[PDB]
Design a binder for these strands. Structure first.
Ligand code: T1C
Ligand code: MG
Ligand code: MG
Ligand code: MG
Ligand code: MG
Ligand code: MG
Ligand code: MG
Ligand code: MG
Ligand code: MG
Ligand code: MG
Ligand code: MG
Ligand code: MG
Ligand code: MG
Ligand code: MG
Ligand code: MG
Ligand code: MG
Ligand code: MG
Ligand code: MG
Ligand code: MG
Ligand code: MG
Ligand code: MG
Ligand code: MG
Ligand code: MG
Ligand code: MG
Ligand code: MG
Ligand code: MG
Ligand code: MG
Ligand code: MG
Ligand code: MG
Ligand code: MG
Ligand code: MG
Ligand code: MG
Ligand code: MG
Ligand code: MG
Ligand code: MG
Ligand code: MG
Ligand code: MG
Ligand code: MG
Ligand code: MG
Lengths: 100, 120, 92, 157, 94
RNA sequence: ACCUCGGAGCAGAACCCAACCUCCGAGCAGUACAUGCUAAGACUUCACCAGUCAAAGCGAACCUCAAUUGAUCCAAUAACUUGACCAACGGAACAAGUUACCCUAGGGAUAACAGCGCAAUCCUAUUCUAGAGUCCAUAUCAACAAUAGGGUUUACGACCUCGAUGUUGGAUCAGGACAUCCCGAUGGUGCAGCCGCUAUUAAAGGUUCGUUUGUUCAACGAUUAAAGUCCUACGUGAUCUGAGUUCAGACCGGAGUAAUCCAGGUCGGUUUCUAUCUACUUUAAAUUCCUCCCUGUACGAAAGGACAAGAGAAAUAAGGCCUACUUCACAAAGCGCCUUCCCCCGUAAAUGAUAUCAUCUCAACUUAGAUACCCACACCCACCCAAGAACAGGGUU
RNA sequence: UCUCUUACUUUUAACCAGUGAAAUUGACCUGCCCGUGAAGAGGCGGGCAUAACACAGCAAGACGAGAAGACCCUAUGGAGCU
RNA sequence: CCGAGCCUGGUGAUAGCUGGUUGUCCAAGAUAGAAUCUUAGUUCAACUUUAAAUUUGCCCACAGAACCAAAUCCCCUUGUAAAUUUAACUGUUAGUCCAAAGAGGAACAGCUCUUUGGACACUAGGAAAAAACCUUGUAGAGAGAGUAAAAAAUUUAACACCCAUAGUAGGCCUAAAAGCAGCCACCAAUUAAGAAAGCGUUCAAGCUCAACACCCACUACCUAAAAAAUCCCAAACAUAUA
RNA sequence: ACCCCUAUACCUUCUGCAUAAUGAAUUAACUAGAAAUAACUUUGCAAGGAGAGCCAAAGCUAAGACCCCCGAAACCAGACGA
């Protein structure tokens, strides 16, 4: 089965809180063939607002998406046509959450 | 595959902050471009080499005048990573016939019509 | 110090359009000026061609602008010529 | 190599320079903001009670007093009609400074407890306190005047 | 002791190269020059409809000059003076 | 296995676009009998050949399908026309095997050995904690799975070499790694002791002789402290061997009409080189076993049974010498004799802050924790020598 | 034969004298380690070493010399046999 | 040198195969493909060269190219100066890496196959040496100058203290299963303790946590390896104004 | 003069050779591009040209200028050899 980055692999619910599932969910997600994480609704929302806040307060005048879309320095000779939509956060099957 | 790049018009819309960053009034736009090739056409596609040859920028660091019209602008938009573009400023107006042989271009991009080689 | 020379406006290479590179090398001891140097004659010819190009492009674009102006002038005269040759009758 | 690999592929050096230039730069605060500058009400009800009635107050230090010994002490002290109150200091001190027993204020340090009644009977307080020798009779008040343990003994005899 | 398999800069296993401060600064300088280019191309003088035919006469005459040269390509003249000049190679004193 | 033609993907949107790439088909059928003639303009399978559409006009009337196919010569025919699974499908008019008895021209454009790339396979370490271990995940073993590493196997690729890079095992000499087989130090134990199991550190020193087999291996016999794992062009053939393997002879079984063949067995079968260059050709600290006592002590219910300290006796390795023995004899040798000296780091503890306890401390801190050899120097013609290829050296009173 | 090799003689050998070849040879003022590279460096990179020159010995390297590979493939190249 | 002697002749046999191919100087010049007893070759195209004739050639504005992504086709301006046709021929048609879209294989290979685009087979500087990565091209002399690309940064794990009676060996099941084998409920006294969250017991018994009090305050950086074979490999340096 | 700095012999072959791929000790001498059909250039004459024959809707006549060396195993004929 193909799995792309940002896709929930398994979902759980019930009369419980995070840490209870988080134990064995981190245990499973460590054993997955890719990088994975145990997330909640709250933690998933928190990381998404964190990524948007980092993109908003980034003090670098130059960004990957600006350079790629404007074809700055002729960088599309070494980029890929998929980088126009990945915006540098993806490299092959790898997702880099530190990239803005 | 690697092909020609269509640059967005959102890239080529200027902003007021850009205007005071590089002072140029949106109304009364500058009339002529001073274009200077600052990079090699080697290790670049043949269409960029052809547009460099069309614009007359075969020799590096040699300024050339071009019109500020949309077609020439489209060519410069294609080849914009190998050149530097400045506005041609005319402090003492256009050169006349009597002032044709005493001109200079200068680094600031101002075509002076009197060149005296004397201190002020 | 090319960046400093650019900030002062004196090119970047000191061997460009300055007094140091554009004044005559020598003159006769009695005071007669030397014949002009080959590089200076060449440079003056290129600057002359550059200035003629500047004048030609500026006047060509100006003439294009006024040609468009007179064209549009003939356009709105022909839409303003809208007098009915005949006075309407019938149900009026 | 394919565009997707099981390992991290080596980028073109211009793309690597692109990533290094387009790294994320956080905002830097100028002068470092770190360097920049319930139970209380209910407990107020029962302490207001036990100081409006119950005019024999005795303060003792809450010695360990293992559970059988503690409860059996509770039972002879109740057989002789006194109560053993345990009220925490964090709500009992402010009541003292705004309720005038500020001279009994500097005495409620450490573990503390209150031997409290409406009847004078300091005689078995002192005999039970002498049966258990490691039990101090820290202090207290009889008839709204402050009395030390020497107070408590001459009011006894 | 430390060798990269195969060739250094091609293949699955390459010698790593790292970005230096001056390489980053050089690239940022070029980025600034192109942002300058973006601004000056963002401000145009005329429009396409105003531009439509302003240099057609000059371009046409330039092409007529090219055609005139390419048509005037033709052999050169020949001279009695040149032939009888070649007679001078036996010009003696006496 | 395929060879010609067509449709779909790869090849998303003008065209084109490969693979012994992924799928589906074709080598016709049905109608008509103007399925006649002629003729602008075009398309085109990347060339040519071949193929495709068609206005108008004359004459009539009032083709479907996707491929559904074959050039020239020549043959048949009065003519019009008609001829190949020429399917190796741009087609030679008509021709198979075998060669180790082989030859030639070339090819590292291309295989075998070796190197290299890669790591599927192989090997190791960690992470997780199911499970096994009476209970107990973590004394020990370990499923599913994840991460990282090695380059010893079998491949895969075809990059150097085919105007030669000689090959398996064996001898001889070994250099190196440590992922340690023994000896050393240490932690844990389901460690009472003896034995073990597991882990950390340690590469100075060591790691046997035989029967069968060409064998690497493997099995067995007898030991030992141990009989390590690898790499070195599967180290090492201008140092050796040639049992094997893949030249010419022959036999057996099988295959083939036969020649001949077998990734089957068997018997036999030439291993050249006078060293030009590089490199090198005398660098004194040795380990291990056993015996005695400690001691039948510690320990243990008993059976069993130590570690330290110390004494002795050997064995090998290195260096040397002939008194005797022995080969032998103005001498050279071993089978004989003599000598052989330092540590080594894993961790275990004390004081004591960050964190007024504690804490062995990437806190400050405390403890366990070499000498020897050589050393002077135009007597030199010549002679002698325990010195020596020449040279050099020692003696000549 | 070997454990396990030792001693002597002859030849060879080395020195003096006489005579005097061959294969080989791009040029050489011809080092070591690691890395690199047509993927195994005396000659390239980083380090280390380094007065010159004979004589004897060795065979680890010069992918050492010899024979336009004896295996494999190719050729609209041959030949023998059935 | 007998799988068919040797000599002479045919004979200068033939060789899509190897080797070689001799003055000087300048210029233009790099690889779509189809057939083929063909894939070590050749012919046609494609590219390339020369000489002519003529007029448009590249870049491209809007509109436009089908139902079941990057882009391309077409194309007036504009920027430029090339293009087509005519004549005459050679040679190249055994291809390498890098970026991108894919296919095969192991989402192996310095692997193989197409497509778009670079560079290499041509110069120079840089990434250590260096084909293919980066910078840069049109030629000479100079004991002048401004620059391009261009030098890797990182160092990680301290965590509380004190306390604990009891309705009850809650009920059912079981020999007993007592908070802790499995089920139903989960109330309730003390100031404050789950009909018990881990251990531990055949079951019991025991010891930790959550709870009172106590108090300064939970102090809380949320992170993580190592191996091979001749000999580690520039020397080094935290602090003088970009 | 060396010492300092720069610098990977040549030819062929190749995708690419310092290559540890080929050839070469060195000297002297010898040793390898032959031509038609057309085209192009330059003359002569010109609806004709060429010293019969041939070509001709500007052609014809003349000249110039363009196509290597070495090498097999083999096949056949006639001799000479026990
Ligand atoms: C060395 N021997 C075992 C041998 C081996 C092979 N085969 C190999 O190359 C096999 N080597 C491998 C194992 C594949 C690496 C061989 O191929 C040969 C030979 C021998 C030669 C003998 C030749 C001989 N001459 C040249 C010395 C000769 O005169 C005769 C003769 N009888 O007249 C030959 O037969 C001889 O030419 C020959 O045939 C040999 C080989 O072919
Ligand atoms: Mg390498
Ligand atoms: Mg066509
Ligand atoms: Mg019709
Ligand atoms: Mg065929
Ligand atoms: Mg065919
Ligand atoms: Mg045989
Ligand atoms: Mg041969
Ligand atoms: Mg191999
Ligand atoms: Mg279990
Ligand atoms: Mg290949
Ligand atoms: Mg070979
Ligand atoms: Mg050779
Ligand atoms: Mg050889
Ligand atoms: Mg170890
Ligand atoms: Mg070997
Ligand atoms: Mg050898
Ligand atoms: Mg043979
Ligand atoms: Mg025999
Ligand atoms: Mg030999
Ligand atoms: Mg040498
Ligand atoms: Mg002699
Ligand atoms: Mg090397
Ligand atoms: Mg020697
Ligand atoms: Mg050969
Ligand atoms: Mg062929
Ligand atoms: Mg020939
Ligand atoms: Mg040229
Ligand atoms: Mg063919
Ligand atoms: Mg061929
Ligand atoms: Mg390749
Ligand atoms: Mg090759
Ligand atoms: Mg090279
Ligand atoms: Mg060499
Ligand atoms: Mg060779
Ligand atoms: Mg060579
Ligand atoms: Mg060769
Ligand atoms: Mg023949
Ligand atoms: Mg006879």
């Amino acid at each position: 089965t193909p799995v792309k980055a940002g896709r929930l692999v398994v979902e759980m619910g019930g009369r419980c809180e995070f840490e209870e599932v988080q134990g064995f969910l981190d245990q499973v997600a460590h054993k997955l063939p890719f990088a994975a994480k145990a997330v909640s609704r709250g933690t998933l929302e928190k990381m998404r607002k964190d990524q948007e806040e980092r993109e908003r307060n980034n003090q670098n005048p130059w960004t990957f998406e600006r350079i790629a879309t404007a074809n700055m320095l002729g960088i599309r000779k070494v980029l890929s046509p998929y980088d126009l939509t990945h915006k540098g956060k993806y490299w092959g099957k790898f997702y880099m959450p530190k990239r803005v | 595959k690697f092909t020609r790049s269509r640059i967005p018009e959102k890239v080529f819309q200027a902003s007021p902050e850009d205007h005071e960053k590089y002072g140029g009034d949106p109304q009364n736009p500058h009339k002529l471009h001073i274009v200077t090739r600052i990079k090699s056409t080697r290790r670049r596609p043949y269409w960029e080499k052809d547009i460099i040859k069309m614009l007359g920028l075969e020799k590096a660091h040699t300024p050339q005048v071009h019109k500020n019209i949309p077609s020439v602008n489209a060519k410069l938009k294609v080849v914009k990573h190998l050149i530097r573009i400045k506005p041609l400023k005319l402090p003492q107006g256009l050169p006349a016939e009597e002032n044709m042989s005493n001109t200079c271009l200068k680094s600031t991009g101002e075509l002076v019509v009197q060149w005296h080689l004397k201190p002020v | 110090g090319g960046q400093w020379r650019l900030q002062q406006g004196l090119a970047a290479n000191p061997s460009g359009y300055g007094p140091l590179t554009e004044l005559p090398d020598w003159s006769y001891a009695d005071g007669r000026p030397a014949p002009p140097m080959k590089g200076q004659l060449r440079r003056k010819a290129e600057r002359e061609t550059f200035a003629r190009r500047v004048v030609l492009l500026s006047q060509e674009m100006d003439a294009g602008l006024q040609a468009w102006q007179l064209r549009q002038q003939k356009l709105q005269e022909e839409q303003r010529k809208q007098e009915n040759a005949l006075k309407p009758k019938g149900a009026s | 190599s394919k565009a997707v690999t099981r390992h991290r592929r080596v980028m073109h050096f211009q793309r690597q320079k692109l990533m290094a230039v387009t790294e994320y730069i956080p905002p830097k605060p100028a002068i470092h903001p770190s360097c920049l500058p319930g139970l209380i009400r209910l407990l107020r009800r029962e302490i207001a009670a036990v100081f409006q009635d119950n005019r024999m107050i005795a303060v003792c230090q809450n010695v360990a007093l293992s559970a059988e010994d503690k409860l059996l002490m509770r039972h002879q002290l109740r057989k002789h009609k006194i109560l053993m109150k345990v009220f925490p200091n964090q709500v009992l001190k402010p009541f003292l400074e705004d309720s005038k027993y500020q001279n009994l204020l500097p005495l409620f340090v450490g573990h503390n407890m209150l031997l409290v009644s409406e009847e004078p009977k300091v005689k078995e307080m002192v005999r039970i306190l002498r049966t258990v020798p490691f039990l101090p009779l820290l202090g207290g008040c009889i008839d709204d005047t402050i009395l030390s343990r020497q107070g408590f003994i001459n009011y006894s005899k | 002791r430390g060798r990269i398999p195969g060739r250094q800069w091609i293949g699955k296993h390459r010698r790593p190269r790292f970005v230096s401060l001056r390489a980053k600064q050089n690239m940022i300088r070029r980025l600034e020059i192109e942002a300058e280019n973006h601004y000056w191309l963002s401000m145009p003088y005329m429009t396409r409809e105003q531009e439509r035919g302003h240099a057609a006469v000059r371009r046409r005459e330039a092409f007529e000059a090219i055609k005139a040269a390419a048509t005037s390509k033709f052999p050169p003249h020949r001279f009695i003076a040149d032939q009888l000049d070649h007679l001078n190679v036996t010009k003696k004193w006496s």
